[PDB]
Symmetry: D2
Subunit: 253 residues, 4 copies
């Protein structure tokens, strides 16, 4: 019965960057679907912990800098120690730096690439090793962007990193699908989170964007709950290496 | 609670081409999720009806040639009369004609285009009118192909029609998303149905294709149940105009 | 010496719809590169004839409705009787019909599809047969659109046809590369022609679109001269089945 | 007269990595079209220098590690001193590291990303600054890959970097089009160079890839001469932010 395929009871999901915004939404969604949650954040995600534990699920809160690739194994080991296994990885921890491309600093390049693509590859590798050890497959959900498809402006390292995310998602699937590992990505559209706060404070810019969203509204963290559960579940077993836009029709227009 | 967002109880899904293979799978999946089913087929979908009614769901079987666009309004009227509303359309009715491109007949062009793209647009229009009347949104799921992305050989009208499907899915979303109508597409990979019967019976070709599917297996009708329920449900509300490959990694490789 | 590769001395190019706008530009550019031209038009291309003749090149002006696929063989026969051979085809003849998708008529569907995709496939076939008879390969250049990539609004049959063009270009290359035939496409951006007459008049819409073209200007027929000569020449021999956007950065933004 | 638009007489082109294979091919093609050449290489490009000077063009041979981004400014300063201006940049310097994704080392990540994407961005930035100082626009040609579109296997940092190249090409076009700068990319297919030596030695794998190239042949450095001249010339002025596959139909199949 197909509805059972979406049920994540007994599963363990590790989500990086789930104190706020989109990551918090995905953590709560996965928990509502039955997952126990391992968070990796720079600060204790108090609100997310409250919401997850209110569902009767467990939350293991790890505090770490995801850009430090030497630390990833330890994060996964803690998760495996508590729950016995890790089944789902959501590589949501990311940053953005805005600066004219002609002036763009090496720091704004390195900081963004280090987190948005390098740490994503290496955390995926770390968790995939654990999936292979367990022998029961696994799910990796990367977070792409509209700037995986379009160039944008003033964010060269962001566009580079997010375009790279879409590419490496393909390669990871190619190599690991044979182990029952599904590596896919979600490309959120224009979502009303802290990352579009400047844009939305400008009435004229805000309307310019909104009028180009067919759905006629901004995305919210809630909009990623269903897509993330879907991609984390057996309901999407023959989807692999693919980026799904959750954009209210942005790319369609 | 997100699992409720996948639940299609109380919904009515109209699926064209559901006597066999992929269409049969999607109809059964939708029924398993709670949908009553309206079928449109050239012949009685006897097995599909048995399976749907075994779930305790209703099945209205309409017999018609989907290529006859003047007949669509009546099909939808009959669906609406029987159930009170139609909530989901799956445009699966399709054919393929194989012939060297240099020799390709006008018949093998027209027959494929009339069904695979023309009737898809006009049936979508017909149902969209009903969605707008009802005022509770709606879902359209078109069926794309790997040949929406790649050219293939000996099937010009199929490649044309399925590439067109991907495009027109975008435009339908652009115009109708404001009414809470989601128009998306599923692009199946190489699936174990009658359409690949000759390919799968040739062990050389078969192995050559399988070796380029990361999943290392053919797709099955059951692999479309989850994705179709997802795209027919509230769990995908902010996905619009988009084509999701269900291909075992084919496009990623 | 690489500049010799762009030289089309002694070539014969058949361009459909070259009385004005983009088709006129491409015909003139092909003529400047050394081509004699065969035009196929609904109205006599008087201006194009003058400009091609002024270069010292020959222009055979054929008059026909390109949607009539039964007439294609004759058109190529006429070209071969006059010039002895055909080396290059540009499938530029096309139309657009604007009407709300929910209201879209069968007429506005059929008229656009018959010309923009059906006649393109069948003319390509007809010329390909001639290329094969001659035994020295050939070039086909189809005309895609930004609406091969994006959905747009109020033009379902145009989006369908132009998306189909991009796809069928791939299949033609796959099947006919073995006959030494290159089949590629040009996707013009927003070009200043009769098509964008409404848009460019509307001052508010015009500014809104121009501000989203990185080049900051509308495209011109002149902008397709270089690209069409490139794709018609030996300088692009290892490009096949591919669509090249000539769009001032539209898709990049 | 359109053939004059391909002529690069009086132009200066800086090509990184042009001692062998594809980079050599593009340097020679640009020189054949009229360009004086500035090379940046690890080793002295003896054969390339001989071939460029034999055409009667100048070759300034600079020796540097392109990954050292602090060194870029001086490289461009020397080019500007020696020729008075730089008009064209080809970012060809790159590497590849093959290792199973599950074992992939940090070194094999960093070395590839540092050269293939980081240095490409910063060298582009460095030259763009000079294009702006000069006030006469400029051309940048980046080198993408089939692995900008597909995932491949055992080369996660290569796929990441080349996917990033395709993305950042879009952003560079968006931001720098206002300075009269075109930024585009060439995606070579499977080319017979050092980089495909092993593949082409193994006759089983060699044939099966060859069978999936519609052209029926490996690409060669000479295949990039025409497309690079085209993208370096006024003939491609309304092309910006776009990637052109030179792949014998690989992506089409």
């Amino acid at each position: 019965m197909i509805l059972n395929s979406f049920d994540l009871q007994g599963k363990v999901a590790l989500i990086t960057g789930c104190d706020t915004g989109l990551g918090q939404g995905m953590a709560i969604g996965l928990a509502q679907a039955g997952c126990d949650i391992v968070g990796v954040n720079i600060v204790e995600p108090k609100d997310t912990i409250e919401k997850v534990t209110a569902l009767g699920r467990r939350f293991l809160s790890l505090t770490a800098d995801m850009s430090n690739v030497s630390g990833h194994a330890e994060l996964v080991e803690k998760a495996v120690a508590e729950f016995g296994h890790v089944d789902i990885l959501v590589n949501n921890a990311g940053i953005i730096r805005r600066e004219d491309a002609i002036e763009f600093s090496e720091k704004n390049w390195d900081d963004v690439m280090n987190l948005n693509i390098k740490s994503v590859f290496f955390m995926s590798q770390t968790v995939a090793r654990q999936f292979i050890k367990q022998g029961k497959g696994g799910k990796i959900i990367n977070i792409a962007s509209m700037l995986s498809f379009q160039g944008g402006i003033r964010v060269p390292s962001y566009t580079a990193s997010k375009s790279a995310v879409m590419g490496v998602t393909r390669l990871m699937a190619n190599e690991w699908a044979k182990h029952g590992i599904n590596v896919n990505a979600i490309a959120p559209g224009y979502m009303a989170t802290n990352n579009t706060q400047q844009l939305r404070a400008d009435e004229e810019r805000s309307k310019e964007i909104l009028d180009r969203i067919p759905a006629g509204r901004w995305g919210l963290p809630q909009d990623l709950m269903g897509p993330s559960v879907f991609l984390a579940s057996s309901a999407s077993d023959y989807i692999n290496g693919y980026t799904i836009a959750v954009d209210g029709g942005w790319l369609a227009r």
